Design a protein around this ligand. Sequence first.
Ligand SMILES: Cc1cc(C#N)cc(C(=O)c2c(C(C)C)c(=O)[nH]c(=O)n2Cc2cc(N)nc(F)c2)c1
Ligand SMILES: [Cl-]
Lengths: 403, 553
Amino acid sequence: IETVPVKLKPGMDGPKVKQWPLTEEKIKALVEICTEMEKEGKISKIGPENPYNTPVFAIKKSTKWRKLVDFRELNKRTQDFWEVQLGIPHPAGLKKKKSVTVLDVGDAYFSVPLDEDFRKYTAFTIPSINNETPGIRYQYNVLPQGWKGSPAIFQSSMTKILEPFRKQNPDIVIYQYMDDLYVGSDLEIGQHRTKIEELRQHLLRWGLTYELHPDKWTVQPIVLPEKDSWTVNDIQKLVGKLNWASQIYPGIKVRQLCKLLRGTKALTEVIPLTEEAELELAENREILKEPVHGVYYDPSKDLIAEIQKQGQGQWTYQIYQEPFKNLKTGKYARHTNDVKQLTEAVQKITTESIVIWGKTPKFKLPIQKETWETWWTEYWQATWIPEWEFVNTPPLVKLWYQL
Amino acid sequence: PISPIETVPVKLKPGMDGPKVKQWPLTEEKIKALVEICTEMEKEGKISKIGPENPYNTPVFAIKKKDSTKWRKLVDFRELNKRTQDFWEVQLGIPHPAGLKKKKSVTVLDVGDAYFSVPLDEDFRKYTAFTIPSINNETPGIRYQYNVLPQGWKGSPAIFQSSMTKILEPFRKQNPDIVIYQYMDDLYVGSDLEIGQHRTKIEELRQHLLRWGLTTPDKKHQKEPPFLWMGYELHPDKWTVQPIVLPEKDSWTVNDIQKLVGKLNWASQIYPGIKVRQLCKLLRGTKALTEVIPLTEEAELELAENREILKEPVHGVYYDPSKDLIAEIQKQGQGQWTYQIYQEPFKNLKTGKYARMRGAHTNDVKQLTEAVQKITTESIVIWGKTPKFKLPIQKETWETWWTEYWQATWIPEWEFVNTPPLVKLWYQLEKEPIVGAETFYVDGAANRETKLGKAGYVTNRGRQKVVTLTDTTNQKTELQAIYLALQDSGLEVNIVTDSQYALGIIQAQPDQSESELVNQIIEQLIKKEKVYLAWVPAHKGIGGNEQVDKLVS
Ligand SMILES: Cc1cc(C#N)cc(C(=O)c2c(C(C)C)c(=O)[nH]c(=O)n2Cc2cc(N)nc(F)c2)c1
Ligand SMILES: [Cl-]
């Protein structure tokens, strides 16, 4: 097959990211896997004249170790190729479907040759314990999993594979993102699962051996309590929370309510609700129930996700592009392992973003950098990796998105 | 010899051409020394003489070897190196003795003339051209180019290492039972064969190496145990750091104290309990290395305690892959933590130290957690797995912290061990307002140009008060106003602030701070029976917030 010429974005050089230390069991699983891939010609050992590197990890799906390459830098540095030059259009109808199934089709890439001149940029290293030896160095000979270039290049072949099935089912939406296919229909869950089975058979002829419910997706509205008697402290928390909301939702009003907070009162004192405060309150509940008037997705802009730890295995999140301009808010709940729970929430929030916008967010994670770096791999199950940074949650924000 | 191994293809940086620097004219004795050196290298094939067209050039020099009458050829590859491609890193991390398995028998081999025993990419040799100038530079010089890896060229260490690795590979496949560590131009080789069948396997290895152009010391010339390697002393069943001598001096300079701290830091790998806080404190400030620093009393106490620890020699043991690793941590005092890692109590594989602060304000629970994370990482590096921890903190204390703190946090399998001082939380804030506890509405404000400040409070019992602060930031006054309310209130108090800043700091339950204020607030929060902290939006006309906002201005 004829390779597609690939080019880095102008000026900038390839990835030079350091390999993270790996446990012995993961190093062994990677050696096994790469020894096998090498025999099959998918990768080749390289010399020191290749200065690039990207990190690799082992994840365990199933009781089978799998290789995960962290192509975040390469993807960032080749962004002209997979986004503007080629690039898969994202369907707005996908998020509308009653059911969306995610199928892994990463195996497909291993049969397409990679541009000879681009191969050096896919260099990665298997480390050794206590630096007994130099790492084992490899680069790719075929479209690698995890590179955003791979689906971009395999795009026109995927279209042929899917054409009979699309023609036969015009009301099914199929979208490719990185290594996965997203398949949405409005069918009853039995006919839906049957169609996925059929799709698998189509894929199976070309060497490609869970269910979302986007309808069930709705805002996690900032909730104002319904209370029996209100204390000064309670009214204060209310104003605080509505004060925050008014940064986001037009039409939020606070006047009638904090009229109640007059003079210097003991925090536990009971204060009766004004006919007006109660209307204002209710009128605010109306507004919080709905989407944010004035906020729209700008496809030229990165997505950001903030996560808050709420205790009792509950986590709240917001997605926006400019701060406080929420495109979406939600929650994930239910381990007494914080890192494990955070990992799950990140993957779930990422998955939603792909379906909604065909883009992955950069996460602001409420956790020590080193803690996350050591541990996230133990639980990660996806075949992509979002960008993340590490942040200390403002104690206020956590409170205002409480449930 | 020059290895018959295939060459590594090498190129210059994408926009660049090879060097073309001008040979300085040299004295006659230097010209003579170079001719003699180059002729001998030419005979072994290390270099080949050339004439133009080759346009490239790198300057050569000759230096007199020590007091001796031997000459050495120095090549200044500064330019060629700027113009040479980047290579992947040679070897990122060096072996730690604590991570070695025990070996019945071991041999140390160093490759002779390592670089000169490995061939240079044929296409690249021309860029290494240099010129021995003629006497006073009158006639055309004698021009050579390298056929082997030049000393001081950018690519040599990486290409050598990869050549040794390609060469060693076949011997590794056929000999899994045998260990070979590569470090620079050394090999360290070990088995659990008795001396006989080992000396024999070594010879196979030397011979394999010779087939490939690499010469090594014979039995007679191989170093003997113990090995002094990289600051360490390696023996058949223990290791330690090389002997450490702490100088006695009447007066210490900046440079003496830096060197002392370096030695102590090196010693802390295996000597438990070394401390350097009070010695590093001295290093604070701006001074010349020559300047004498009077030892504070605490520094002097610390040097003595260190002195006693070093008095008797200590050693570590090697790693047994079939046993778990246990890690123990102890609080040593003000921000200082020490740890030991053993598999059999209490024969340490190694020890270590942790001090770093993470911010201006922390508590002991956070710090302990950071030390656990740091030890976990080092343990994965050295042994390829995480240790089981024994921590001086009650399970209940840790779970009370984990549940209520806003950051995700987590430590692997651990157990409590009663080794005081134990780590605890020294106060907890109320989760609800306190009935019958006076409510203080506090505020602070500073004028941006003046730096004048007013901190105050109004209470629901009609108390009021404001003090004036000089040269204070708008956020220092917010802390003052809270301190003020703490020191005028009862054992139970509700405090209402509009400072997210102040709230953030207090809500994290600090037990130590770089701030005097925060440290005074803390000693107050400990005294109390109950404290509840609420936050309100500033300037919304809320409650008593307006009243105290008005008094400060
Ligand atoms: C990094 C380095 C550097 C140098 C050097 N120079 C020597 C060694 C070793 O010998 C060594 C090795 C080698 C094979 C990597 C090992 O696997 N395990 C081990 O315990 N040792 C120490 C030792 C063992 C022994 N029986 N007698 C001694 F005296 C020392 C290691
Ligand atoms: Cl769902």
